[PDB]
């Protein structure tokens, strides 16, 4: 269902927004989950270019720079 | 109601016809004012899942 499928989101910063904050932070903090951004919701929180539209050129070019050298 | 409104706005409505008309208005306004909230909640869940 729509409300159930939105529950699962890779970015924990995104999940901490519309879900119950306490549980999300705990459940993520124990596993040491590493949020790579890559999404919209999370990038809005941190205040950088949305990885879409005008920003899509930027993020794309940065994403490839990663896992390289 | 089994006794409709036999008059219209060009003529006058008597006491009863208006009083009976009131529920339709108030229920109309209430329904919309609630349907406003329903729409918003829907968009929320939708944009969250996409």
């Amino acid at each position: 269902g729509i409300t159930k499928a939105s529950l699962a989101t890779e970015s924990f910063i995104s999940a901490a927004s519309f879900q119950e904050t306490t549980r999300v932070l705990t459940e993520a903090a124990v596993a040491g989950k590493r949020d790579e951004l890559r999404g919209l919701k999370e990038n809005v929180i941190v205040g950088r270019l949305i990885p879409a539209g005008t920003g899509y050129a930027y993020h794309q070019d940065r994403m490839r720079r990663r896992a390289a050298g | 109601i089994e006794t409709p409104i036999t008059a219209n706005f060009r003529e006058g409505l008597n006491v009863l016809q208006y009083f009976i008309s009131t529920h339709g208005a108030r229920k109309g306004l209430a329904d919309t004012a609630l349907k406003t909230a329903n729409s918003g909640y829907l968009t929320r869940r939708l944009v969250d899942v996409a």
């Binding site: 269902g1 729509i2 409300t3 159930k4 | 349907k35 329903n38 729409s39 829907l42 869940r45 939708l46």
Partner: peptide, 22 residues
């Protein structure tokens, strides 16, 4: 049934009360 709540039930996948079987 029908209306805006009907849409919400559809997108919510909710199983009807007395469903059929295939």
């Amino acid at each position: 049934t029908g209306g805006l709540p009907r849409v919400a039930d559809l997108f919510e996948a909710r199983r009807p009360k007395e469903p059929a079987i295939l």
